[PDB]
């Protein structure tokens, strides 16, 4: 069974075996988690382009980087976005289990740039749990907001 905990820290300082980038489909560096990942592991972006709802892994800069493309909720219906968000997290879980990754730092996909202006912390976290429950990985969820940290911790605890 996987273990879940939450850190309020820059994900670029994670202590896990792998990190999930909240990526865009073009594999470009822009504001958000992606900027922190590009600064710390700059060569991890080579050929990282992957369609919405998929994930693409690379070993670069002594790190395993998993580029997961959550939906942009400005560009899909709510139901379409919810399916694509579930798919991105399942693509992450498959890469974790198939590559024998023992621990992973995970941001909440589609809760920032891609949130379409809405609070999607619980939507994103519920898809994260459902997908990563298929793995044996130690999962560390990263956020920057003290309120999010407690929400996430509350949600971890309720389980
Ligand atoms: N350094 C950090 N450490 C820990 N948590 C962080 C972080 N930077 C941002 N976050 C949080 O991670 C979540 C996903 O944000 P993001 O805005 O990065 O994630 P999405 O909403 O999936 O959008 C991805 C796009 O921004 C895409 O173009 C990429 O360029 C960006 O990733 C948001 O809740 C942010 O508050």
Resolution of this entry in Å? 1.9
CA atoms of 43 and 154, how far apart (whole Å): 36
Compute the Cα dihedral for 44, 12, 20, 109 and give only its sign. negative
Question: Taking CB atoms and a 6 Å cutoff, what residues make up the pocket around ligand 1?
Answer: 10-12, 22-24, 30-34, 36, 70, 107-115, 142-144
DSSP classification of residue 116: T
Ligand 1 pocket test, pick from 6, 8, 22, 69 with the greatest ligand atom count within 8 Å of Cβ, gives 22
**Residue 16 CB neighbours (<10 A):** 21
Which residues have CB under 8 Å from 25's CB, separation 6+? 49, 50, 51, 52, 69
Whether the Cβ atoms of residue 129 and residue 159 lie closer than 8 Å to each other: yes
Identify which of 151, 143, 117 has the alpha carbon closest to the alpha carbon of residue 32.
Answer: 143
Question: CATH assignment of 1-159?
Answer: 3.40.220.10
Question: Method of determination?
Answer: X-ray
Structure tokens at 40: 């710390």
Which residue in the block uniquely carries the two structure tokens 């990563």?
132
Q: What is the 3-state secondary structure (H, E, C) of 23-76?
A: CCCCCCCCCCHHHHHHHHCHHHHCCCCCCCCCEEEEEECCEEEEEECCCCCCCC
Domain positions in the chain: 1-159
Which residues have CB under 8 Å from 100's CB, separation 6+? none
Atom of ligand 1 nearest to the CA of 12: 1
């Amino acid at each position: 069974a996987p273990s879940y905990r939450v850190r309020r820290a820059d994900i670029s300082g994670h202590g896990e075996e792998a990190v999930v980038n909240a990526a865009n489909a073009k594999g470009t560096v822009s504001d958000g988690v992606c900027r922190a990942v590009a600064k710390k592991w700059p060569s991890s972006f080579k050929g990282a382009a992957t369609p919405v709802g998929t994930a693409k892994m690379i070993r670069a800069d002594g790190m395993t980087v998993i580029h997961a493309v959550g939906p942009n909720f400005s560009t899909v219906t709510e139901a379409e976005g919810d399916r694509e968000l579930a798919a991105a997290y399942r693509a992450v879980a498959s890469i974790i289990s198939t590559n024998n990754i023992k621990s992973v730092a995970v941001p909440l996909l589609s809760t920032g740039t891609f949130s379409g202006g809405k609070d999607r912390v619980m939507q994103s976290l519920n898809h994260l749990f459902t997908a990563l429950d298929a793995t044996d990985a130690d999962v560390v969820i990263y956020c920057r907001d003290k309120n999010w940290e407690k929400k996430i911790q509350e949600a971890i605890d309720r389980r």
